[PDB]
Each structure stands twice: as C-alpha cells, then as structure tokens.
Amino acid sequence: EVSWISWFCGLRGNEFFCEVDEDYIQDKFNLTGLNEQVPHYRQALDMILDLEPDNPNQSDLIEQAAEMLYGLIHARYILTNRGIAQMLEKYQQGDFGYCPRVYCENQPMLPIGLSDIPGEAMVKLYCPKCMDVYTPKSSRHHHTDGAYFGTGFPHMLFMVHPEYRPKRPANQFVPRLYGFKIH
Amino acid sequence: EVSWISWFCGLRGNEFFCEVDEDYIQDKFNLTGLNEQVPHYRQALDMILDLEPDNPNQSDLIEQAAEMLYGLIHARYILTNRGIAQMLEKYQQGDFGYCPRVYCENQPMLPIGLSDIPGEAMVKLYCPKCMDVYTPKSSRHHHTDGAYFGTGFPHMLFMVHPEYRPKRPANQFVPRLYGFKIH
Numbered sequence: 273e274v275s276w277i278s279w280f281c282g283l284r285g286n287e288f289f290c291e292v293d294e295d296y297i298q299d300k301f302n303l304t305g306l307n308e309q310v311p312h313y314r315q316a317l318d319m320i321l322d323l324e325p326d327n328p329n330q331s332d333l334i335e336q337a338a339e340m341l342y343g344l345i346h347a348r349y350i351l352t353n354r355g356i357a358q359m360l361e362k363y364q365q366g367d368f369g370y371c372p373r374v375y376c377e378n379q380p381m382l383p384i385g386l387s388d389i390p391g392e393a394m395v396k397l398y399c400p401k402c403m404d405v406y407t408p409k410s411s412r413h414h415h416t417d418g419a420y421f422g423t424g425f426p427h428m429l430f431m432v433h434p435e436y437r438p439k440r441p442a443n444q445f446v447p448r449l450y451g452f453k454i455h
Numbered sequence: 456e457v458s459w460i461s462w463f464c465g466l467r468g469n470e471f472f473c474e475v476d477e478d479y480i481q482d483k484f485n486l487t488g489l490n491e492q493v494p495h496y497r498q499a500l501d502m503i504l505d506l507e508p509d510n511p512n513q514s515d516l517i518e519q520a521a522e523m524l525y526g527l528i529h530a531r532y533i534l535t536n537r538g539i540a541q542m543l544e545k546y547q548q549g550d551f552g553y554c555p556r557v558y559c560e561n562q563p564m565l566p567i568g569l570s571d572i573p574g575e576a577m578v579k580l581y582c583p584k585c586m587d588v589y590t591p592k593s594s595r596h597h598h599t600d601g602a603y604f605g606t607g608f609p610h611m612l613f614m615v616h617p618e619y620r621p622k623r624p625a626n627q628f629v630p631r632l633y634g635f636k637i638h
C-alpha cells in the first residue's frame with residue numbers, strides 16, 4: 273500500500289527529504305552517471321520504483337544501495353521546478369529548522385550540502401539572512417549525506433522565488449562591559 | 456543535608472550556573488542594591504544560605520524571590536577571580552555547548568546576557584571564534600534570564616585567560632552552483 277519513496281521519506285531522520293516523482297526517475301536522462309556511483313544499480317532502481325525483484329541476507333545491501341541512489345536522485349530533483357515547489361512547502365512549514373543566530377530572529381533555513389560528492393560531509397543548513405551555514409541541532413540528522421542535497425539547492429530556490437529572500441538583520445551583537453561598548 | 460545552592464545548580468535547566476561561595480554572599484558589600492530589585496529580600500537571602508524562616512504557603516513566593524536573588528548574585532560573582540575559575544572548569548567541560556556555525560568547527564561557547572536588566576532577554580551563548588551570539592539549542596534553557604549572566608562575563612574571562620582565545624576560522628562558506636563559485 274505504501275510506496276518505497278513515501279516510506280523512506282517518512283522515516284525518522286529523513287525529515288529533510290521530499291518525495292521525488294516517479295516520472296522524474298523514469299526518465300533515464302535524469303539519471304546519467306549514477307550507475308557508476310551505485311552498486312547493484314538496476315536492483316536499487318527497481319526497488320525505489322516498487323517493481324518486482326528476484327533467500328539472501330544480501331538484499332539488505334540492495335536496500336542500502338536503494339537509499340544512496342534515491343539520495344543522489346534527490347539532489348538533482350530539488351533543482352527542478354517541481355522539486356523546488358515541494359521543498360518550498362517544507363520551508364514554509366519550518367521543516368528544516370531555524371537559524372540559531374540571535375540577530376537572525378529565527379529565520380527559517382534550508383538544507384544544503386558542502387559537497388556534491390558522497391562521503392565528504394553530512395547535510396548542513398543554510399540561513400539566507402546571515403548567508404552562513406550551520407550544523408543541524410538534532411542528531412537524527414548527523415548521518416544524512418549532504419550530497420543528497422547538493423551545494424546549489426538553496427541558491428536555486430531563492431533565484432526562482434526571490435520574494436522569500438529576507439531583509440538584512442535590523443540589529444547585531446554589541447559587546448558591552450559594565451555598561452561600556454568595548455572592542 | 457544538601458545545600459540550597461547545590462540543589463538549585465543541579466536542577467534541570469540550570470546547567471549553566473556555578474555555585475556561589477557562602478563567603479561571597481555573606482559580605483554585604485557584594486550585595487549592594489539587590490534589596491531594591493528583589494521582593495522578600497531578607498527571607499530570600501536566608502533561604503539561599505540555608506538559614507531558617509517563619510497563609511504560610513506564600514513561601515512559594517520566597518522561593519521565587521530566592522531564585523531571582525541568586526541569579527542576580529551570580530551575575531556579579533562570575534566576574535570575580537573565583538567565579539571565573541569555576542566557569543572556566545565548566546567551559547573546559549563543554550557545559551555551555553558548542554557553536555552551531557559549521558566553520559567554527561565546534562568551538563565551545565559561554566553563556567551571556569544581552570542585558571543586565573532582568574526581564575529583558577533570556578540567556579544566550581557567545582562564541583569567541585565568530586564573536587557572535589546564539590540561542591541555546593535546548594529549550595530547558597529558554598526560561599533562564601540572561602541578566603543572571605550579564606553582558607560582561609565572557610569578555611572578562613578571556614581577559615583573565617587570553618590563552619583560551621581561539622584562532623580565526625581557517626575556512627569559510629563558499630557558495631557554489633553547478634561547480635561555479637557564485638557572487
């Protein structure tokens with residue numbers, strides 16, 4: 273009853289993902305080159321798409337491959353108009369959390385990868401007000417590869433939706449000692 | 456046979472406090488003016504010091520007063536040599552948490568008040584590497600008044616202990632889109 277993609281996205285720790293269309297995945301032009309990064313590609317793919325498979329312990333490995341593949345597909349997908357739209361809905365809901373920087377007054381953030389290359393760095397969060405990047409406060413997010421979001425995504429969303437760019441901070445930090453402005 | 460001060464500091468949410476010496480509290484010169492900011496001062500003070508008191512349910516109010524008074528005493532105490540020493544121990548233990556800013560590579564932080572006036576702002580956390588201020592990630596800390604730490608404390612500690620000042624971040628965030636440094 274439940275689709276693999278629906279299932280995966282609803283797992284704990286996977287709150288930053290949206291659901292990629294089957295349409296997108298089914299167009300091989302979108303998947304160029306992934307078959308060189310993922311073991312068991314053909315099966316990982318069948319799995320993502322709820323197709324029928326081929327009794328090993330092994331199949332656990334296809335699940336891991338399935339997860340990596342979905343991740344890499346995801347980073348490409350959220351650069352498309354549909355992808356952006358779904359993530360924007362998430363953004364509006366604060367799904368990605370809020371900037372911890374006092375003078376950003378709780379600006380909602382977006383997920384981002386420091387690298388497009390898997391295994392380099394876990395997913396981070398970008399604040400468009402201070403335009404810097406933060407480690408997610410919740411540890412359920414510390415094992416999600418940032419390559420499944422990519423370096424470009426936030427910039428891409430604000431380009432398509434300039435109306436969501438916040439204004440510069442009204443105020444900033446002013447260090448004080450015994451009443452005096454120091455430094 | 457647990458002291459009031461020991462009890463308070465061990466309460467959940469009070470992890471950023473250290474234990475003020477009785478010696479300090481018993482020198483009235485240290486408490487100048489606090490009697491004008493706190494209701495039920497005399498009793499709040501007796502309570503802090505584990506002396507004895509006398510609708511005797513009211514007393515709940517003396518406990519609230521006692522907590523405010525200790526808080527205000529604390530903000531004066533942590534600017535002294537003994538105070539700083541205790542907070543440094545805490546700092547070294549990461550009791551106050553770590554900077555969420557990716558490129559600060561988990562610099563440990565210090566508590567800080569944006570105002571020395573009670574009721575203005577809840578306690579914040581100061582990172583000495585990026586020299587900006589953050590909201591504590593944990594909500595158990597969102598009802599602690601920053602006036603119990605004050606604006607001066609961090610600056611004061613690094614003045615007494617310059618050897619703890621971190622170096623500037625090696626790196627910083629470099630926005631990229633499809634490989635390109637964008638600007």
Ligand SMILES: [Zn+2]
Pocket residue numbers: 371372373376379399400401402403404
């Ligand atoms: Zn920010």
Ligand SMILES: [Zn+2]
Pocket residue numbers: 554555556559562582583584585586587
């Ligand atoms: Zn920092």
